[model samples]
Target: NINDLKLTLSKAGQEHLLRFWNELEEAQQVELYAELQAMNFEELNFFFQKAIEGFDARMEPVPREVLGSATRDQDQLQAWESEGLFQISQNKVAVLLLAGGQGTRLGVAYPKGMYDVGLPSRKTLFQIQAERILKLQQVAEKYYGNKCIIPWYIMTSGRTMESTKEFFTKHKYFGLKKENVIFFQQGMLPAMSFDGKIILEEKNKVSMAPDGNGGLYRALAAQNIVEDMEQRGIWSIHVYCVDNILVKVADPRFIGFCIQKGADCGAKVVEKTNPTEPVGVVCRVDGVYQVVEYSEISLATAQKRSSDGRLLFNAGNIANHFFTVPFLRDVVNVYEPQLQHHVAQKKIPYVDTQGQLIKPDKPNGIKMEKFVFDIFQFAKKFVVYEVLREDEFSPLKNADSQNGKDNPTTARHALMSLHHCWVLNAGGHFIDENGSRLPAIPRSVPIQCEISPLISYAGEGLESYVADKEFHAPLIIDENGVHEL
Candidate 1:
């Protein structure tokens, strides 16, 4: 049966396919035979080895403390609102959102960014993110009293880009200028069998996967976005994941912080609340600054108690990074030599000649990825700012219960709780279950605010309204209920 299959492919397929197969390395040819024989061998082991060889070519880690004694200058913050440092409104800063992922993990059949997370206005992740960007643009314009354009660069993938572009186009770029929104594709790598010798897909095309976030650098270079940034005088870029609901879009304070430090790249981090959080620790690894995944950091080292028994490395990466345009260009052009490949095991699907879909329970091959943090070695100067995780760090990864409390449902609740707390902090009261006016505690009172689909879909201006609210309920508001006035 297997020999018949091979004969069919060799005869029916084009000569180019045969040449491609014939040119394989000795090991690869052996792998092809093993697959054709349907040998009960560890395919993953073979592929892992080959993937590692490719990975070994580019992998380099950054030092822990690239900038010694991490500190934020207070004088800079005090003068931020009044000084030119915060006047980054004049500088063309772009927001590059990585939205290439699908919602299959979330058990949804569409783009993850398009799912409604049960907000009252039922705003999708993309809508929430766009509104936040619009609000920031407004803030910048108000400060400068001039029209400020904050362009959005959305990096999409082959699987999700079509729907993503269609959704945005249907909404007219979410009320922003069409020219201001740019969509670009990140490179993909072939999916290899576990043994790394045989291609899983029968087609001549390379079974590619997303090149990884580090591919953003190459995307900029390949797509000529770097030239566009230079022509627009854009100096710095704030890159963030689209899943973070609380992401501060182009926050001038953060940008100014990076500018003041003369940092070519800067990262926003939060102190790990506990030792068990699944977050990468940013530290000096072998004198080079890098982010080590929690799994990579040994359990003993992670649990290592400091002098006072506190965790030595508490800086957890939030994926909110600032990169200068020139530095980004330089890193992409020359820094590929230092990049490392990482092999990830994932469920892969394929189609047979009969048009039948085959989903494998185990990894069929290796997917190579380049992490964005890999470029830390190229940073001449970098800084890290600590922020409250509750205020800024929320990533939507798994749709299952295993991802801590940061999934779509939990993220929505967190936003609501935050708003409720803010209202109480401002001397407001909410009707409790007993129909009594419960005094809101800054700590005990949960922020139960939601965006009105007609007005606000994100928490952008909710902070101002919390200060202006006289009385609030779970889903209702009453301004005349205040007797103090």
Candidate 2:
């Protein structure tokens, strides 16, 4: 055992180090030595202490606050349109997409953002999102009567860093200028054994996982992305997860809602379809605004209804948000370490001291992660804006599909149904699978439709395309609608 543990190993770490060093080929001894020299045995000690004390096991009811809405018919709409929309159209906003996840959950080897949910144009999520950024830029410029640009910051993980850049390069940055599209990486954390030692998967390699998406806070500041935003004069940043098929990239209305409300931090929420839905709800925790996970709230609290027959905790988080530069700074420089590190126990592969591979049959190690929303606790004034769920909030994360679910099939149908609604509203109706006006049921039509963001941002500017034309179902308005629009 090394008495000078800070330089190399602890009393406990030395034994394993000795065995591991002996097992390694002599050629890599110096490499291994250098690696061990850089680690913090001290930090490991702190983690060990926390594990020994056990994590909190109690569930408590979080305080709730009044929610805001932006529904078209709502009294808030006129405010958002006149004051809110006008503010963001001045080129003061930016878009941040958290797209670090891999598509292995969707049965693919690429980033989740690159997966194609079978849109009519067969465009991947990146293509769709990239186009939205361009459309948003145009939306601002059209109103300002001058060139307006929005910088897009995308955060990737070690698993996706290279692939994502290459994917975007191949697609020509989805029509956004090369300079406006920027990239950064979410940091990583070492996976740990149940006993608190870092798990080693190779002689020279420690098992590592991306710091949870929650790592967005430090990654933003640590990467100096804030400075980049400042140089670009981007004050309001819109952030959303990549898996949402119907995500409104650089959604002007949402950003304007945040601005009109004088928000430093805001999350887009949608009314929950049912009490049993598992999505987190935006609420106050002991007076601080934060997303309370379904698992963290009691069944009674979730099932509680308002006098108006609505779910009391109905503001379901859609993973869409707006954060000011100052708020993001506070999250990283001050509140970072204070955020909760959630415990995740999972089966992890490791190499023993003998340098032999061990495949765990069940959860054998723990990984601690901080959530992005944990930063919501530090917001001085948080905004919760409720929008229509059908117009947004479809995520692709499953591999199965039988008429519906989280799989590609359901994700595809969700897009189809959304465009279907937009089409009908634009004075265009679709014939069903049986070639009838209404197929007597939903999902009865194989008529897949996709509206290009270039043609209409959301549902606006679509009148000309559908008003004069009667198109059949299974329509794709990509190249065809662009010329007409």
Candidate 3:
């Protein structure tokens, strides 16, 4: 057995794995041997090639027609909204969630979906999103006088699969039917040292990282998710990331807009706050549709302005996407293999040959990742649907820090700001503890003012509940109805 493993390792150029093998305990030896045997070293060698070749892609401005809040006429927006609601009522749409990553940046060991932004209801990100899906179904039912269903497919990683599943069950799938919710795990790739050898986390365990959100394509096929969609009669799928507290699940406007445009693939974007905002911009690169990262474009290109004084390339990608069922199948079966892997230089801690666990301060290894946007080039019919950033694109990427960008405070503030506007737009007014009316500005409103998704999904159906009603701070509109504190 040892001879056989040695020969395979020698041929694969991974003999370094066995350097400390003799020192391992019996259990460790068996696990280490099994791990080595299970790996496809050929694939490792192929992916590692990126580390040496490096990553390079040319950037160009989007040449296709773009549509969204800023560009669309009022009647057109209304038409798409009606069409989207109609589609949802037909049970022809599904939602795919990309939630594979752990919230290490948020100082949590669980998935980002489980983090709470301290709203009045104290709902976690997952509960908030789940409620949106439920509310959308209700809206569709109310409009069409028929029951509607939107199957929710959530993709998790090995690190988060169990916790996410358990959390959802604990909350009874956040008021969604148990059968409508599906959980699948994304694939993971081995972490590689600079020299091309797979790194070991311990004597018996190999270091591994998620293969990035692009793994969604493979995961769908591997888990029979496409087939599930086919069987469910799901034609359009909305895929979104989990960190955005402001995300609208199964958004009719987006679904209907994409269907109306006859799009095989679509993206919801926000106009960049500035050229240097560090968010990817939806654009064409060498005649192919793609999202070009802010770092890739030159200063001159980024600073360039169009005729209307808008940034030449201002469609910032927020990772909200729409795809037809057939397009997803094509991507998985045809283009996924050709998708290039981008190398991420990270400080990976690993076990040395002498069994010393070394935590390096500098970049120690490369983690190859394939982004979800990588398949955009394969779409024959694509649309860039722009939305206002304040309405849709606040991401929770970190814990509260000194700078405070994208942290809990900022995310909660974004949510409350949006809700505050909803109350004001509904002719609702807020009063201070001293019986004085508060200003219309969001900052002036109390932090406790939160309208639950159940009360108003995207600020609809609130006139009767709030119009001409004077509420104090700490107002909460949840399933128990509106309460003035």
lDDT of 3 at 176: 93
lDDT of 1 by residue, 204-305 (tens): 333456778777877877788888888878888889877777776776667766776788888888777588888887776555677877766776667765
Off by over 4 Å in 3: 55-58, 442-447
**How many residue pairs clash in each candidate at the backbone level?**
32, 1, 0
Error of 1 at 20 (Å): 13
Query: Candidate 2's residue-wise lDDT over 252-314, tens digit each?
Result: 667777777688988888898588887887776456677877766777888888788988778
Best by the TM-score measure? 3
Compared with the true structure, model 2 gives a TM-score of 0.90
lDDT of 1 at 266: 83
Give a tens-digit lDDT track for model 3, residues 372-426: 9988999988887878888888999877965469999999988988888898899
Model 2: ten consecutive residues of lowest lDDT? 56-65
Q: Rank the candidates by TM-score, best first.
A: 3, 2, 1
- Give candidate 1 regions above 4 Å deviation: 1-50, 54-87, 202-206, 346-364, 400-404, 432-435, 439-447, 451-470, 475-485
**RMSD, one per candidate, in order:** 7.8, 3.4, 1.9
* Rank order (by lDDT, best first): 3, 2, 1
Clashing pairs in 2: 214-372
